[model samples]
Target chain A: PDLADLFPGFGSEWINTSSGRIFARVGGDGPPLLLLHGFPQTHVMWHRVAPKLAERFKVIVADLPGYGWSDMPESDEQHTPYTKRAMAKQLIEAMEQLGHVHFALAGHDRGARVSYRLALDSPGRLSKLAVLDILPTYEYWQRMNRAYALKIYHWSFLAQPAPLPENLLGGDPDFYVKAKLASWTRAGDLSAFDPRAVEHYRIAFADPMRRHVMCEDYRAGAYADFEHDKIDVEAGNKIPVPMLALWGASGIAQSAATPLDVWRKWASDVQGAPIESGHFLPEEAPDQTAEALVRFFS
Target chain B: LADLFPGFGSEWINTSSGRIFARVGGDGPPLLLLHGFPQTHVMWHRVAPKLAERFKVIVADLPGYGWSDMPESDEQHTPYTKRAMAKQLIEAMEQLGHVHFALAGHDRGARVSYRLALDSPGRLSKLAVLDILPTYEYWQRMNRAYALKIYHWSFLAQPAPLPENLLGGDPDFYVKAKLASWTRAGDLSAFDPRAVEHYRIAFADPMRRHVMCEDYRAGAYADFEHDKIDVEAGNKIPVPMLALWGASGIAQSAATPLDVWRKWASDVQGAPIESGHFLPEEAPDQTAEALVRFFS
Candidate 1:
């Protein structure tokens, strides 16, 4: 069904990835750009920002395989490859099939991590990289103090001895999905996320396979992000692409003091700015984010 | 009972209250996450993993609630109420190899979490309570909505033997009827099946039903008195307190919520999550997210 049929005017397409069928929605036309969403949320979250960017650049936004209207298989690898490296590969494959060679990338939370991974693994491909609402996975993990532990509770849950936790989650799928969405974004944002978009999320998690994929996504993050980061470090690699990183205050990833210092060691050419909103910086404060992206990318 | 609740892999504790049965699993910092009335620790299945990553998660079926030993202890001494059960749980925590830990409780467990803080604040380094308020606040604030939503509370708390006889007619009446109203559209089916079964099994016992009444009855008086004493005697939970309330829940409202917490806590802060009352199970991700922020 066209997205409009599902969400009125929205269209979706699925592509074959190394793992399984990967799904994404494409719109706009100009310089091509891809936006990725984070856990417990989907591509629809970029609804406000993507339309603006799509005005000047082709936009492809997709749910992290397990979260939205994406194909998520029953598997064990959830957490690690949630990094941009693997997601970038999938994005590139999808874009390539749809007739594109290179594109700029921007991602939020989980999507941001994937964007970082894309830059590290294929520096030649991502012309410009924008990361939002997160520090590098390694940087985040290293600062695991008591308070930090409480903030990034996802890490611990994903790292659990599998099958057991996964089974428990499968026990009640709706509770799991709804809870994920509710927990991550503020209560006010639920209405902000169009009802149709929310339905897509509910539909995605309704299936049992998606549940496994989600668990694996978290599982991979628990085990994989650090290992991949180490590989990049040992190779003396950095995402040499021109980079833009945005964070929010009064939210989880807000900088305690300054923003740029956290990523100086990782990005060869990086600049950081602050968003005056909660986690959904792009949506809650779309105009500010749009201005920042246009200025940064231009 | 394992047929009903999976992962109950029995771990036992002998306290002054009785033999407390706990399910110990996962890795990280030690955290005792509790369930509420008509349910066991299974209420936490959805939200526990997020917390477990940072702390060793302890899920217990409070004495008289699930597979734990019946109230064989002196009823005159322990009373078998929520307060007594709370004490039993603290003793059980020590019995299960967690003398010190943080705590996050939902519903019945929240009450225990509050008691744990009051009885021994230093033992817990962090505390979070979901969808519930102090017992005193609940009784004092009883309104039409409260009476309608929790209709069974008054009905079930009726002086003993009659309440037990009426409830014992249908083995699954409590679970079915309770789940019917306790949850919204999805939660009855959305919560873990094991948790659903645990609720049925816990309440199926006539003695357990009586124990539940005793728990509520004690809340009617003793828990409130003790809470006031705890507040007056400076028995504040010194740790950073994180309180999360469901926007649409049977429990407290987000309206002026932070003000309510400052009363019982020393250093208090909280946020209201969007979801119904069965937060940990009904809104696991939101629960997990709040937890990530609250604990982090």
Candidate 2:
């Protein structure tokens, strides 16, 4: 029932950040490596990959704000509180609080977004940035076409004005989250997920408040983050750090755009390739994901 | 629904394609009033009766909508194409003995009016579209904000069973929600109870549900492509046009409705109305006054 039982060696704690309280678990003793989880799940998403990475590096796995056991703070009209910049700050502060001044970072899905933002906003802090299964949000919006429209309609749906999306998704949050977990995989291979981890996700997502905050993250993506991205673009700001981009060979990232090319536009020294998995790469191909991180971070 | 138009007589004019349900009244230059999505010709209940006094108002439900024939969709959704729908109305008008008439529509009907004006310019003396931009333009300029509010455009346009199934799950809830969301107060109180019943009854038909999806499918797919080819070939609406929108709706702020129309039509004039998406119902008095003056 407890996450500790899932990862015996890993110790968990809640770190207070200026944004909110973030729940995290740290294990191992080599170089510090922060692992951020994506949407519809918490730090538990790294249960499969964290231990493997822990063998070679100190892995810090944390729940994003508004997900899992983390606090869901109120966002302003611009949804700044949920912006990747805001989210990145909390995680960065959490890492610093744990006495890690510089670290290697890897993230998947929404976590990958915050990872990229962290690399851009705090370039000197991350030695090696690994983003899994996403292009920059700005590039995603710019490159929208028919295929992307039909495939990723949720980007628009969840990002709709406040109560509209909140009410629609609230109809059955479990079904909604489960459907996402099932569908985002190749042929819906939810089998890759730990049954306990799946149960944990279902419980956290079933809360209306959690569902509402989750939608706010996407709202920030569409509006606030988009504007922030435009300003950065105008200022000619790029992720001035060595980055590794990995994506599912058959997931939405591949369907929408060439992930490597999209990342190359934002990061200076980008390099990586696809794993033989789906959107949930960490859960679906933990060994390969850990290998990719170990190889890149090394 | 029938009594909404006080003196208007209901009739079914048989075109070669199908029978068109319409209400005919008044006696000046023939003017055709078309209704848009979810709602029927009764959307003009408050507007049409007043206009009927001066113009020969022929308010018809766009095919596959309110009291009209639900034609099966052909490949490319051609049967539901606005061009096909416009032709059907033109044929029906000829049967009613009016070769050319002024045309106006709201929502889906506005789309048909657009297609009719471009396809058979001689049949339209003047054209007016309410609460929308051209289909081609809408798709060209879509963004996250626009897509959020108008998700139904994509949802209803998806191939086949997807939209039909989602809508069929609860058609009453679907229709009522749309009506309420599009109104200024964000409630169904803006809609007449009889009109709401008419919408519910019409959408209750499973066959019509599929047809509605096909109509939108045509809009998102075939219709826009056709409009693009027309634009590429420098084909523009020859008739003078009037574009009206709800001040509180997507069109008002998202686009300059008249400027966009001016690019597609030779002459254009438009202004904002104090309503949401349902300009016809929410601001019917002002809507009717604008229609009467513009048509005259």
Candidate 3:
């Protein structure tokens, strides 16, 4: 909860938006850079790498709505409130409030989804974009198989009709959260995460509301966002801005599909490679993740 | 209604593998009717009587469903595999004085019927599968659209205890939801009250719930692997096969159902009925017509 502990020189603030409040930490000074965290996690995912990037550029690490200290918009039948489009609009608004009209952006997991949507929706507002450890939602769904389904079972599980997913996850929130973090990594353990960060994830996920909110996010991705992505692809709407696609060498992205090749289909200027880690690339291989971010954003 | 089959008698028949519950009637060629998921032999209440007019109809609950015994499973969930269920049904038919018969299965029963056709080709004179594709095709072409539609294929297939415990929290609600979701009218109204009660009674038992999970766990594991091996070995279904799908359900929306069957069977005939996933309950007359025409 203390930005100083993780980011000594960084200052924390909450910017209000029409849908909800966005929690963010600001540090350094130069071209603005926005960092978003993925599901079952928060802005704290950037703790290990944000400080390093702050030395070269202004870094803004924000918690997505319905995650961490951010407010949760009500979940609707179609899960519209949690769509990357809706969440992206909120983040863009938060940046406007902070006087960064244009910035570089990067996200991991679910956050990567939001970043990609933001880039597609408002290409002119972003200088560069980086997506960590993911494939386009549309493509991922198109290539779904037994192996993919088994590994990423939670995507379908969480996206099921509300209370079903909520209740199943509620059985043991700690085990579920820890298991997810431990499973989708290079070492296949929670050793990659700092002890303090692990505790924070545990305490934050213990809230049933947050759990439901996270489910809504996945539901949106599975349904509403998937529909939007298909329409964009049909219309040939590519990400106009330069993009970087980084992923774990031993993650679903590599096994199921190639990140660089998949990204090339959607962006004109795209380049990146697999880092020597698992899904939590920034946490597992921070120096490499930071180096990629700093080089791409610079 | 029992009145549909005036002379049909329901009994518990013991076989080499286990005891099975069945409704036997009529006096023509032998016809075995198997019901699918979330239901039992009662799913044939409407169609079986009509089929009985021209054939001796045997409607039996697949193993671990309805009044049938819930067999224990191994880590591979083999006891719940389609092969095991098909073997049990074959023995049940032998005990009932019919070693070779015409077969029609809906949902899970269709899965067993499929196994029977492939594993014991001589046992089935004709085969009809309602509202499904081969497990091999289903897994081979799985995608987000299809996976989302049939999420339970993965959910119920999760390692035992997980799906069992979750569904146990509210089994009735879960069954009701599946029945409603898979029907054209989108509710239990499409199902007869008596038949619905039978399903409720069967699933009400916690052991039955675990058994159902194992059934699917086998599907996601052993069953699928078996299907893959059969396809690779060029072991096609030799008996005449019929594939029926609901016009408004997953098989129709997600895949080319008829074409998929054509690849796996030497002779296949199928078309979509104007209904949801529960074709027998939702469109009984059309289903009966299709089966009578195909098997006659």
Candidate 4:
């Protein structure tokens, strides 16, 4: 609750970084665990899960640049640190600024992918790696059989240029975020997602900066993730760290059968678990996911 | 055009048949709004100011409906139904100004929107269809209750002289009665009297009255047939679509499901506004918010 007092809805602080300025929220105590948010959402997404985790761990949540309260870069080239490796470097540089050498990194969706890169690129810095609601980039793209290809349309759609998609997107940032939250949910239980919580998402994505960052995130996933994965695979780069994978069974991520095998290939020690919820598992089924994370990383 | 409404700007282009008039203003991305039948672009005045904050809205009076010229270019204007009206509207957009824009239409506007999706292909990024059902299913749903409720269809289609004379004697009488009758019982009084008066002024003209009848009469003979041919030919809109219906409306209240509209638009999502059929006027904020959130 004190953590809630410190980090209210739609809140974050800017820390100047070598890559670029980074936005972060510091809360709670114990072993530090950084939380990363995904597309069309800011740090606001972890609003429910962050408080619970902050009870036992020092939770530092950040909005990737061009998201939340952070500054939106003007061009695609200006979004250099958009690549996962570059983003992870920025996180490391940011932590160094905070004078912290060691911390466990946990990311959901896009953040999860960024953490995956951090574990691979800087295994010594990142302790146990906990990934929420996403597999490695190659694994998702490679295993997307017909069943999941439909659900993950963002992979293709966001790959387009500026203003076109945004022009198509129009002015309804709430619907953009809400529709995703709705479609990714099971038939019932829509009210499970708090309106304030969705507003937290809406406040960020409502801005063109946040919208462009979202498109950039997807663009990087399609082009940059593939390029990086190919190079890493060619180098036989396997992350030698403990990996924890969690995703909602009802979501697009759960459609793949060998999700664990894919994770094990990247991390020498990996355990993938299924949670019962929607794409927004943290908000949709918070206590359940928190309990699972508590038991897994305990 | 902004002379009439301060912020409004307009462009008029000569169409193959007549002058196509488009009044544009507001801000943000272009949002081309097509008005429903029996009403002109002015019907949107209640809602446009709010929506304009986030969108550069273009409120257009479809040819033969409002200030635009209603010329008889074809053999008889038999082909000038909703779809033809929409095609001409798209042509008007091309000739006058914005070539590609997000489109939303209400009632008869929805009919035009359906065709625009099919004919214009990928030009329209997002589509919003309001109030009425798809033209095909609408006619097919004309049961005894529907016929009784919309008695004007029968009354208007009755030959000519009797219906025209009765309506012409006091022009505002038919428009006023139609506006009063179309609204839900509770909303009948709550409806903006000023808007109703503006509608009265537009339809007061005798040509606008006959044109309204001809538009529906074409529905009886040609419009529905055109939609039937398109459906039979297996055309569908793949763009993301939002369908909004007034929850308390007489036609399709909270009970109307979205499954059939899905058959026409591959990606259709919608919710019911807690108001009457004229959602934009009755529930402007909710309508504006929903329009911004759903399509963005």
Candidate 5:
């Protein structure tokens, strides 16, 4: 069997969860660590940094259920299946089936959203949490100013009823995939991403069902995830776990507020700073990202 | 549109901001009709001819839409602002030899209609706005519900070619979805294939789509600021004004549209038409009847 060797020496696996199959690449040894990826990307997002982080820890790089080679769940009105709560549960079961009762977790973007939910719902599940370049969902929505709204327009665009964003993106997924990747990087193009990893992202995102499921994920953020976060905030439920919030120095999250200050509200024991890149910190600044992650998790 | 506009003749008038493409005919006093987004003057195919019986109708496309010049965007998006469009419309009326005229606008055009009344007070004998709140009110009251109702305001207004590329990927699908979703029937039944073909031309052009985004960008930035400052200065529409929203329309879906308009104008009167966002197309009889009664 032949495939691109972005994650050299990693064994590929498809773990069945309550929802459906989730694709992941696994290798390395030492403490167990789960690395979750974000929007418009697959598990390959971690290729640049995961190889280095693997030197100190066992790394499991996974595609979110709606992304990469993962299975698209049955569609629903409430988008319950794709909510951060649902995703957090599925990933937890994934780690369980992979032989870890508890593990350290590092997530970027949408994956970081799931990480926060996991820490809040099952405080004992994660040994240490590192959220790469994101803020809490409730904070992001509530503090949506005009400038912020411009940055994260996809949150609203993708969440529109159904078939709007999906149909449009499906027309030319490559156009969107390339433009999005090019824009979100500090280098402002696909140069920062490995050619193989870029292909993986393109192949996974090109699936029509995956596009629908991706929109469903954002819908869950608006309707369900925000509600859950609000209830937690109302009842004084902050994430009771060690958390690190490393944002891009000029990242989308940093544009909203000081990452540490916003993270401190939803979490108590929090430590982080800027990584001197764009949204894709690991891809753009892998050495610095892997170093900070190593220093924090160790 | 020929069958709908019957005796109407097409004309291209050069304005200060840009050249405008319009359909003109009818008799008596000149009445300028400006159209909204994702639509051209053809949206009034159902109502404009009917209004033409009583008054001369001049239905024109706004800048950056349908056959109109796609003005290059500025750092401020000034060319796409309601103030700027309103100024162009005034020059357009003057070019057609009308010293003063009645004006009616829907959606983006309604923003232009009201902005004209605010900036150049005595230019209009009467003004009617269809299915929109003030630009400032839209932003001032944006919560989750309102945000969802008009997500395009934020989505389309995103910096240039972002929306252009996304929309340009498949303009027909985007326009078709917009046409179907925002109506009371929640389908394209109220629209004619003829008019759709006309509207499609705007979305299909990459430059026009960029201008479309600029129109919204102007709404959020320059237009919103203009409205906010006018409100603080206690400015109100000087001409007699009418506000008509669809009974199941976007404006009424959020707030009491007439009540909101009353605050923006010295004299305002209107109620909801038995229709949706496209009042002229969806409820032509009622929309035309209201225009005739009010303007008479």
Candidate 6:
């Protein structure tokens, strides 16, 4: 009836950042590697892959603000706190408090968004950057054709003004979250998920404030982050760090053959390929995900 | 439920396609009024009687709303297509012995009116579309602002059971949310209690939810494709047209509804009423005045 401790050997610490309290799992030996979880997930999403990466590197997996064991702070009219830049700043301060000046980072979904934003805003903070199953916020909005729009329907749905999405989804948050997780996977079910980890994601969504913060994250994506990426992309700015992009061979991001060409436009030196999994690469195909991370970050 | 529209003969008119729920009254030339989304024929309760004084006004719910039967539709959503609804709706009018009529439709019904004018030319003596542009226009202008304002187009258009099941969680929540979001007053002060009840009565039904999903599915797919075909071919509605929009309505988020409608029709005129999206209900007097002036 309770959430199983998915990460046993790791030390869980509550770190205070510019945004709010953040929960992170720190473990392993080599150079510090920070892993951020995606939407509808927490630090526990890396439960499967974190162990593997930990064997080779000092792994730090944390929940993004307004997600998982972090504070869902109130947002201003412009959704200032939820933007990727603000989130990246929060995580940077989080890692700084943890005594890591520069680290290799891997992120998935919205976490991948923050990873990319970190690379852009403070290029020197990330030694190596890996984005799983996404493009820049601006790129996603541009490619929102009819077919593509259906694939990422949540982007627009979650960005709708207050109370509509929060109320409708709040009616049954568990069902909504579970359905989303299942649908976005390659196996079309929770086969790849640890029941305990699934419980973590499910419980987090049951809170109305949590749902509001989630929507604010998308609202920020639509407005603030979109403008940020647009100006940078037009001005020929890019991720100065070496970037490794990985997509699910059958994921939401792989609407075309792969997202490498799109990522190339945003990164100076980028290399990417698809894994035989879905959007949740850490849980669905952890071996390949960690392999790619270890190969690039090494 | 108690009658909302006074002096109107209300019934479910059986047609070849399905039963069309309607309220008919008033005298001179037949002027058919089609109501839009998340509402029904009752949307015209306040406006219908006024127009009835001059024209024989018929306000009907589009298929899948109010008391209308859910017609069988294929995977292509043919039955719910505006073209198909127009064909069947025209048959319903023929059953009433009016071969051609001046048509004014609001929202989804407005979609059917313009499609009817384009597909079956001359079926309408004149056409008026309220608070919406062509499906092509809406899809093309999907920037961050437009998409956020009208997310329902894509949200509802998602493949079946997802949107329906989620919306079924609290149907009234959904109804009120839509009403509150689009209204200029940003609340339900203008709407009659019975009118809201009548809408929820249909929307609360799971079958009706499926039908509305199909309606939007067709809107995003077949309806959009049909409009694309016409626009790409540079085909304009040969019929005279009027575009009426709420100043704070969804269409204005893109641009003047009239200016966009001009490209879709040869001769068009329109203005924005001081209201939100529910023009017929939110600003019934102004809506009725515009209809009477255009059709008279």
TM-score of chain A taken by itself, candidate 4: 0.90
Clashing pairs in 4: A169-B296, A172-B292, A172-B293, A172-B296, B27-B55, B27-B56
**Error of model 4, residue B21, in angstroms:** 25
Q: How do the residues B15-117 of candidate 2 rate in per-residue lDDT, one tens digit apiece?
A: 7777899988888999998888888888888888788788888889888888887777787998788989988888999898899889998988899899888
lDDT digits (tens) for residues A1-298 of candidate 6? 4877887799989998867898888899999999988888888899888888888899998889988878776799999999999999999998899799999999999999999988989999988989999878887787766676767888999888777788889666777898899999988888889888888888888877888889999989889999989889899998899999999988877794359998888888999988999889988998888888888888
Model 3 chain A worst lDDT window (10 residues): A1-10
Worst 10 residues of 5 chain A by lDDT: A144-153
Cα lDDT tens digits, model 4, A1-298, are 2112335542456888755677887787788788888865667677777777877888888877566766655545534557787778878888888777788877888888889888888899977888887877877666643224334645655555454345435434555566666767764445877766667676665676667777777767766766788788778899887888887877767676556767776778888788888777777888888887766656
CAPRI quality band, candidate 2: acceptable
**Higher-lDDT candidate of 4 and 5:** 5
Q: List model 1 lDDT by residue over B1-296, tens digit each.
A: 43333443557778875776666666667777777777776777777666666667777777777767777534332555556776677777776677778788887778878787777776788899887778766655543334334435454444444445545556474466566455656337667776677678777777777777777656655666777677667566677888888777766542356687788788888887777778777778888888767666
Give me the runs in candidate 4 sitting further than 4 Å from their true place.
A1-12, A144-146, A187-189, B1-296
After superposition of all CA atoms, the RMSD between model 2 and the true structure is: 3.9
Worst 10 residues of 5 chain B by lDDT: B159-168
Per-residue error at B164 for model 3, in Å?
3.7
> What value does the interface RMSD of model 1 take?
17.3
- Residue-by-residue lDDT tens digits, candidate 1, A229-256: 8777778777799999888765567633
What's the TM for model 6? 0.94
What 10-residue stretch in candidate 4 chain B is worst by lDDT? B142-151
lDDT of 4 by residue, B52-156 (tens): 778888888877877878765243346457667777777777764567779888877777887778777666889998776766665566532343344454445
Q: What is the DockQ of candidate 6?
A: 0.56
Per-residue CA lDDT of candidate 2, range A224-254, in tens? Answer: 7888888888888988889999999887788
**Candidate 2 chain B least-lDDT 10 residues:** B161-170
